[PDB]
Amino acid sequence: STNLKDILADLIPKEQARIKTFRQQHGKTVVGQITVDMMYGGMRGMKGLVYETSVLDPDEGIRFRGFSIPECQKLLPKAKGGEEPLPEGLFWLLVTGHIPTEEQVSWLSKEWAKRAALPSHVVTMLDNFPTNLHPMSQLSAAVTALNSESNFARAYAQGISRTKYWELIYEDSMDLIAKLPCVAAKIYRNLYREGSGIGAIDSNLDWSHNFTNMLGYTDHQFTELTRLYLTIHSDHEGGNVSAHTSHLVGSALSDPYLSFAAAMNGLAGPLHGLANQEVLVWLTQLQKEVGKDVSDEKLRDYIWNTLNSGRVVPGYGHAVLRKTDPRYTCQREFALKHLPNDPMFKLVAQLYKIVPNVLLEQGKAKNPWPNVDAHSGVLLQYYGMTEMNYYTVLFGVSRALGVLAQLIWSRALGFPLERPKSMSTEGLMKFVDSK
Amino acid sequence: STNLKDILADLIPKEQARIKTFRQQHGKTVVGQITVDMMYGGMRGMKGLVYETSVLDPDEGIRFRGFSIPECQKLLPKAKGGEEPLPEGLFWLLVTGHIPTEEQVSWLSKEWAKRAALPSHVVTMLDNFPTNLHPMSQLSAAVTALNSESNFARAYAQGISRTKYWELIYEDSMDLIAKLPCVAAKIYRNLYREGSGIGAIDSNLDWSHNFTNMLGYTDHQFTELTRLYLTIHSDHEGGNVSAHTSHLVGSALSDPYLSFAAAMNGLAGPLHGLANQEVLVWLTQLQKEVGKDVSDEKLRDYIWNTLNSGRVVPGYGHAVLRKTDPRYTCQREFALKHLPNDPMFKLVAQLYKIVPNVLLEQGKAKNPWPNVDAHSGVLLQYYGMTEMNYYTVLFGVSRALGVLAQLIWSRALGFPLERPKSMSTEGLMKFVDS
Ligand SMILES: [Cl-]
Ligand SMILES: [Cl-]
């Protein structure tokens, strides 16, 4: 009814049988070809993994168990008196395939509050990290050190049945998600508030609100933002580096602490976890140059000069998505309600009005619309979350929801060790010459 | 001449041109099909990545830049007064494609000695870890915290040219390899020697010997073992979880500290890093039961009972090769020279005599021959390295050589972000229907 674990236990068999049947008829069906270029190009365009939780729709954007972002915005429970969807309900959705009721979200909020405690060795470790150790490094180190709490690792060493892997993975995943905001806020306070305390978990608050309290914020609108943010960054298919890394590491039966810590090292990569920061750096320098009251014409000129010097507008352009990323639109709506007169937001809006028509006219980038990263920085910054190094940590806490939801399923469905075949250049040359 | 970095700078262009030409002609050539079964089966049999440092020959075993294990054993430099190949020379081989001279190995040994220092925050952190935090967790946490030393991370944030990525990756990789034995021995001592100190790096010793000194061992033959061990576990293609994880994380321009730390979380996985320990647990239970003077007949019976109850003999019966893993044979040779009368070794040998014949007769498993993991534990155990949790850390330090050698090449050749396409079950069902 409200126990997610029991609901999950009923869903799993039906899903194993469905996959069994599908593999009997279509197991040998060809879905793609592998070319030399694909091996050298980082498996680009190669369908290589099954990842259940989310799928990118070319017309609507990312879908969470079939539900578009606007549908999630509407149907997922909100906090009492709030308007943004709670991350709890997103997790329930990714895990079950079903929109949770109020009671179910409320139950999950209490679970994550109860399981929040950090062992003292992780507290000590975080408290002794120096201020030059990047926040993502601290996050991944702390999560790795949390694996001493892993009930999966202990049960595996005692010879537990394969049919039960998902249960321990579920437990550890729930513990980890509960603990993450505590780790993340400890890092924030140690780095940017001179080591002051995170205060206590409140057992009747939702996950985002306990998170904002521990960060030291007291602004209802910031909490609403954080709920929306944690919800919308939660998952984006299996192929991105953080999802794929958690999947790959998890396929060796490394526990969730270890899989999520590996994923964060992937997320810390500049080609994955920095786009928010890059947009914001660019916006800041833009506004310092041309001033807040820049005209449409002058901004349109600046954008033409940016393009004509062979540079891109950060946050604009997608290869498959045919409209504005609905994750951008969510943020835009939020900003129009709560900070419409913020000079930086007004620049972001002005660019939405101008950049796509300029990109359409240049005829170069296929879909000239913005993605989530074009909007997120100005919102964080407006509420005083100005430490750009830390933004990737927020992304990380959100992304836990999606990759741990799938990890439970990967173990429930018995996904094996991920082991593609490598070749050397020499080997591939021989291989193509025979034939 | 001896500066590996300059030699590497000359090799890189020739290799970029070679790959450019091969892609112009054969870029669109099909090398395989993807099936639904492959997506559900963890990409099994799908040629998915380019990894230059090592290749598995189905007739020979693993090859290091074309050289088989017995050839490496012969050609690679040894320590003064020693017989086992130094890991230094293996690294040089993987990095250059060439067997290093004496001078070159000697130069590399000095490099790794000079760069060995740990920052104090990593020392503090290791010194505060509790005894219930698994050694692989401590290893990965410490390496992640070492990323504050990363010159690649700083140069990238300053906008350095793509053509120079490999240089900084080389530097950080050399620093990491240097530091790893210090991290690993600090963990060993904190866990199993009551927090005693690791002592100092000696500038004139090779990497393995500084490593054994820091662990607290003073047995020449153990140092020889460690050299052989670190050499032979160094690389095994790109598709295993630790290599692939370093490759995937590295493709996002995460520095070597972060890539290697992720790889170790993968290695800590029971389906990847535990086979050594599993063989040894099984051997221990076997020898407790039947005693050290067991007959061939009685052992043959035990193995038949093991198989007939639907269980496997650990270390034997994998799908990879046609014949004995040459990495097993290396260890067997070692044991025959240095500990031929060890009761546990004598069991290992007795199993080599009997298990394959039984598996051949059962007709079930494709390869009835043993791999490296069937032999390594008894050797470690003989020299007093009895802490089985720690064995994966040794594997880790060895595996650094192979994955960091390739990481330098991946950045030299401009390999992009690894980004395959995922599908859901529902999505794949739609996809096959239209
Ligand atoms: Cl993503
Ligand atoms: Cl391996």
UniProtKB/Swiss-Prot annotation, chain A:
Keywords: Acetylation, Methylation, Mitochondrion, Transferase, Transit peptide, Tricarboxylic acid cycle, Ubl conjugation. One of its GO terms (cellular component) is nucleus. The keyword Transit peptide applies. Its EC number is 2.3.3.1. The modification N6,N6,N6-trimethyllysine is found at K366. Methylated. Trimethylation at Lys-366 by CSKMT decreases citrate synthase activity. GO terms for molecular function: citrate (Si)-synthase activity; identical protein binding; RNA binding. InterPro entries: Citrate_synth-like_lrg_a-sub (IPR016142), Citrate_synth-like_sm_a-sub (IPR016143), Citrate_synthase (IPR002020), Citrate_synthase_AS (IPR019810), Citrate_synthase_euk (IPR010109), Citrate_synthase_sf (IPR036969). The modification N6-acetyllysine is found at K47, K292, K298, K346, K353, K364, K430. It is found in: Mitochondrion matrix. It catalyses: oxaloacetate + acetyl-CoA + H2O = citrate + CoA + H(+). Coiled coil: none annotated. Pathway: Carbohydrate metabolism; tricarboxylic acid cycle; isocitrate from oxaloacetate: step 1/2. GO terms for biological process: carbohydrate metabolic process; citrate metabolic process; tricarboxylic acid cycle. The modification N6-succinyllysine is found at K28, K47, K74, K164, K292, K298, K346, K364, K421, K430. Key enzyme of the Krebs tricarboxylic acid cycle which catalyzes the synthesis of citrate from acetyl coenzyme A and oxaloacetate. Belongs to the citrate synthase family. Citrate synthase is found in nearly all cells capable of oxidative metabolism. Homodimer. This is Citrate synthase, mitochondrial. It comes from Homo sapiens. The lineage of its organism: Eukaryota, Metazoa, Chordata, Craniata, Vertebrata.
